[PDB]
Amino acid sequence: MIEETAKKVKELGFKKAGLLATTGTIVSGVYEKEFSKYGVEIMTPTEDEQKDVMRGIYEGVKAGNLKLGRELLLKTAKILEERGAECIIAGCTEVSVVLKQDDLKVPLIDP
Numbered sequence: 001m002i003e004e005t006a007k008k009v010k011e012l013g014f015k016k017a018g019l020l021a022t023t024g025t026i027v028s029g030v031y032e033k034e035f036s037k038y039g040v041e042i043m044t045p046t047e048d049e050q051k052d053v054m055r056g057i058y059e060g061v062k063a064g065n066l067k068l069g070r071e072l073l074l075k076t077a078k079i080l081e082e083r084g085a086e087c088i089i090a091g092c093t094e095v096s097v098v099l100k101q102d103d104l105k106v107p108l109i110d111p
């Protein structure tokens, strides 16, 4: 659950979490909402970067082009990280397929 992820992130003392998920999810703003209830901030990529996250999930992972998915998702995760994310949230299972903890400096958490 999004709310359980939020409490866990808060319990780890993190104030800023990076999010890799679908545009539908980011537009609903459900993560920012649930995380705000625990005082935690959600970091999302720019609108163009978000399009590449979408490509990474669908044109990449879901389509079978695992190389492309890894490339685009890893790059986005590394960008959120470099920007200050204390943890990266794998919002879609496709993210966890090509992105693993050994790829990041910060915790990779999935629902």
Ligand SMILES: [Ca+2]
Pocket (backbone or CB within 6 Å): 100, 102, 103
């Ligand atoms: Ca690895």
